[PDB]
Amino acid sequence: SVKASGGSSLARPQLYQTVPVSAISQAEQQDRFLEGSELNELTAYFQSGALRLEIAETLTQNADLIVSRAANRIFTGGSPLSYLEPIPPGFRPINIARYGPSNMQKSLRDMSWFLRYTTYAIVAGDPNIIVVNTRGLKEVIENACSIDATIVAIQEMRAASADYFRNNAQAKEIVLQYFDILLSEFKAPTPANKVRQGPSNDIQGLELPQSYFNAAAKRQKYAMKPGLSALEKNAVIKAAYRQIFERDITKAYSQSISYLESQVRNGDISMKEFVRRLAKSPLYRKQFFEPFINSRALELAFRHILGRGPSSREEVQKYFSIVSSGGLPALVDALVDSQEYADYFGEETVPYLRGLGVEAQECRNWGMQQDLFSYSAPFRKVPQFITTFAQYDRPLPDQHVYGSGNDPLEIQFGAIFPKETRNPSKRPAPFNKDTKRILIHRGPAVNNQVGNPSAVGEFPGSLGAKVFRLNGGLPGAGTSVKFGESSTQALIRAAYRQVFGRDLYEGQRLSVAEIQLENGDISVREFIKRLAKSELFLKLYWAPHYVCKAIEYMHRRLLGRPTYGRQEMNQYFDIASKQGFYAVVEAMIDSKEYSDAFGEDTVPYERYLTPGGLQMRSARVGSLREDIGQRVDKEVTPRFV
């Protein structure tokens, strides 16, 4: 299996172009309101909409007759309509019995599909769907379908469809034009795939069918040339700022480097040199270098200069070495001077985000590049490409099965989880249903229940946490100065500190449960069950959290350990689905392991830690032992003394 995930976000490639999408994207890619041009296109399209819907209505109503005329002209020797799901020199009618039922079905389906997508294109106001799905259909069906026959069928459908529109040269011309586009595109040979060759030996080569590119939204490309009008040069410079700085900081904050802009618009420097000097500038330094560690800064720089994220472990390694050696100038120079940069953008073209639809995409950095291209990329500080690439090459991490965000801090009290949206740090990993998380026992290592399952309940002594037990008798099981009042109350407060992490404020303690415990009417287990099921516990630790975060924190408090994996998590989560919070608490406290580790008289306690929690506790300067992770030299007095 795969050992890491770069994340997966919903991908929405454009299937085809429509007039409103075209206009609105034209305005939106330039970071502006729709102007007279786009608004006028929208007005004209909306005005034509009534006629277009009339065309679509008449064609869908009479689609049967049009398809029947096509099928009758194309086929001979039988009735093609028995089952419904100008003349090329080589055309000859096709025999129904010979041609076969499956291929006849595909013929009728294809004719109807052509008419259907023609109506779709009429309504959309753009033939892009027809071009996309018809250029290269010929070669797809040459070997089982006659091209001359298909051409004649499409011509018959075109004539029959236009026959319903003697109205005037408004409906007829549109129908004829869209059918002519369909005809010329079916006659088209398959265009070659767009090849994205690997810039080096650590990056694979890919190719994309040209139809995929034609469907996707086209990336607007800005190129600085000497002859452009001043307004065009302004647009190009704004695009350069939007690319390098991720937004128009000149519009937002009047931030700009005027002499660089004058040089680039004069042609003194190329757009490539302008990009180089802008990315070296103190503006860029302050915005996308100073706030980040070098590892994240280089990923952002790849976005800004190349329009893509890192492609491999070797690439991040190489460029992190470069930034370690020469800092931001070295990084920018290496990126801008790369053969890849000149291959895509050359000297004049403003760099653009490539991504899905612009060229063939790699699986290895899919999710990471999705995240990188978001406008929220500057607020991820944790590197995503080096982390994920390294984790590909290594076994599964120490991490909750549902992700790093589901691991709370292993502190005395509080349910502190990383927030998915705040400083995004998510680290998805594919844990299947059967993985078991390695936990560190708080006590003698050999008492870990994995290797010593009968060690369960063995108190850890000095190596582990303090354990509170109702070993002594309870009071009144009259006289004052009965010593059995201090131990029972110490245990009650210990149980409060265990279930909630810390002691409650005055008025919050479940006094009835406390007296019912102090009177021998219940057991310690029953009392902690009451504490766990209390409305206070619900409000504090169940209600404010993701269901599985609440369950995980609950498990740590009640069983004294994190969950091992998907088996425990799934059972508690399923109970949460079916029954609710009280039933989840019941399941945890009525489980066999609770009974083994804790009887009816033991307050639960921390029995295990994750590696991360132990490292948090024992890796600080004041707690780090001298022999851990270093060579301990024996000191001996010099022999000359």
Binding site: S5, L15, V132, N133, G136, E362, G367
Partner: protein
Amino acid sequence: MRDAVTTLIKNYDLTGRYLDRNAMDELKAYFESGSARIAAAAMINANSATIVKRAAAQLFEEIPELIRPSGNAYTTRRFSACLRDMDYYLRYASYALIAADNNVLDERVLQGLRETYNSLGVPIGPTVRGIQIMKEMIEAMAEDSSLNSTDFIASPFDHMTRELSELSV
């Protein structure tokens, strides 16, 4: 990328060990299989387009929903993309056959593949079935031809099948 020799060397360097008898035997096995591996790669090169086309046709015959409305091979755009993906799998399977090591598939095919298909809604199961169809076609082709060793052929395809497919049991 790691081939069989690089994998062995990594294993031995991890422990700082010189290559011993077992290492030499494994290297010998790879070198003696090299001719058969080269022949299998050449045969795939001679039939890659037809292999892909026939495998896709068989898959769409086995799962007709793929080329019907709401199927992920529906429309020529998606159909072409699907045949493209099949071509990818065959090319990288040929690489893996030559290398006698599936790490090339792990590094350049499988890592992040589930994420991409989930993002696009591409159905994994039919893709795995298509991989298996191509595997069977390659095996039959190798059997028909004058090739001596053909047991290694299944290894890459099965690997992809195991790495990408959902865990059922």
